[PDB]
Amino acid sequence: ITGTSTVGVGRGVLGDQKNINTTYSTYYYLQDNTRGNGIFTYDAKYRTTLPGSLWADADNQFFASYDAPAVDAHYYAGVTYDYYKNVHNRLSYDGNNAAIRSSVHYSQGYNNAFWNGSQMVYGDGDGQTFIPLSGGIDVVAHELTHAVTDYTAGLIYQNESGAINEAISDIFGTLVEFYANKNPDWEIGEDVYTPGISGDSLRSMSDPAKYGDPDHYSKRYTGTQDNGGVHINSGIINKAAYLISQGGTHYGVSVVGIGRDKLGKIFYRALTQYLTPTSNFSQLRAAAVQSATDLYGSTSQEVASVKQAFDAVGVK
Ligand SMILES: [Ca+2]
Ligand SMILES: [Ca+2]
Ligand SMILES: [Ca+2]
Ligand SMILES: [Ca+2]
Ligand SMILES: [Zn+2]
């Protein structure tokens, strides 16, 4: 909407106060004009028709319980935009400052979030498995990263390419979480998963097997559930990424860690220059090795560590 840029204040899903960029024209709308061609947050009003209505508020204060998922979807989309721009020189998901749209309060008791081809969509959860999913910065960045993938490598959402697609979203979700630097970790969704259980998460990158996800290619799922296991086999790539960054010895194979920033550079380059819609795990290894070679040189520690990490998870 046409209006003037304003700054509202509210509380997110976890009860934390934050400022949000809004737009005033009769109402205050969740429309942030400070980033690209805008970040827009919508109310789906417990229904499934998308996007719903652009979020309107009378007073620019967002402290109602109903407001909390919108506050976080809007704010964390901004953080994710900043990460891609500041760290990777990428302007929004398409590289040309496409408007970023999110809807919250999608459906009833909805234990998921997704990119629908055009926008992000967040359930409120059922209060048992999830609380509103936009409360997790890693979740928001995971979803926006699906848009980045779709505009770049275009990894098909099934089997190995789909597991890479998933891992890319978990990797960048985590890197954005570290970028914001509030309780960062290598777990996925911990802030919004199972409010009645402390210390758990939906997935772990550092130890995927703690939730039954494979941490080695020999343990990959080959059935048809979950689009051929895209949220399961992602553990193999998540583990490799964790090892590249943090190091470790895994099934007897030692990896020298090179840190988060270099992990991000290597995987961003692989995603945007080398991966294709049909890339499999072996092709990801080759793309990561080539990316590290481009950035750091063939004889570099970074290249050696990429090879060690893929060796450790059984991907040649
Ligand atoms: Ca208000
Ligand atoms: Ca965390
Ligand atoms: Ca996390
Ligand atoms: Ca929990
Ligand atoms: Zn995903």
Swiss-Prot record:
Cofactor, free-text remark: Binds 4 Ca(2+) ions per subunit. Binds 1 zinc ion per subunit.
Catalytic activity, reaction form: Preferential cleavage: Xaa-|-Leu > Xaa-|-Phe
Class in the EC hierarchy, top level: hydrolase
EC number, UniProt record: 3.4.24.27
Any GO CC annotation of this UniProt entry: extracellular region
Keyword presence, Secreted: yes
Temperature dependence: Thermostable.
Entry binding sites for Ca(2+) 3: E177, N183, D185, E190
Main location: secreted
Residues that coordinate or bind Ca(2+) 2: D138, E177, D185, E187, E190
Protein name: Thermolysin
Binding sites annotated in the UniProt record for Zn(2+): H142, H146, E166
GO biological process: proteolysis
Assigned keywords, A-Z: Calcium, Hydrolase, Metal-binding, Metalloprotease, Protease, Secreted, Signal, Zinc, Zymogen
Top-rank taxon: Bacteria
Cofactors named for this entry: Ca(2+); Zn(2+)
Subcellular localization, as worded in the UniProt entry: Secreted
Gene Ontology molecular function terms on file: metal ion binding; metalloendopeptidase activity
Record-listed Ca(2+) 4 binding positions: Y193, T194, I197, D200
Similarity comment text for this entry: Belongs to the peptidase M4 family.
Active-site residues, Swiss-Prot/TrEMBL: E143, H231
Positions bound to Ca(2+) 1: D57, D59, Q61
Its job: Extracellular zinc metalloprotease.
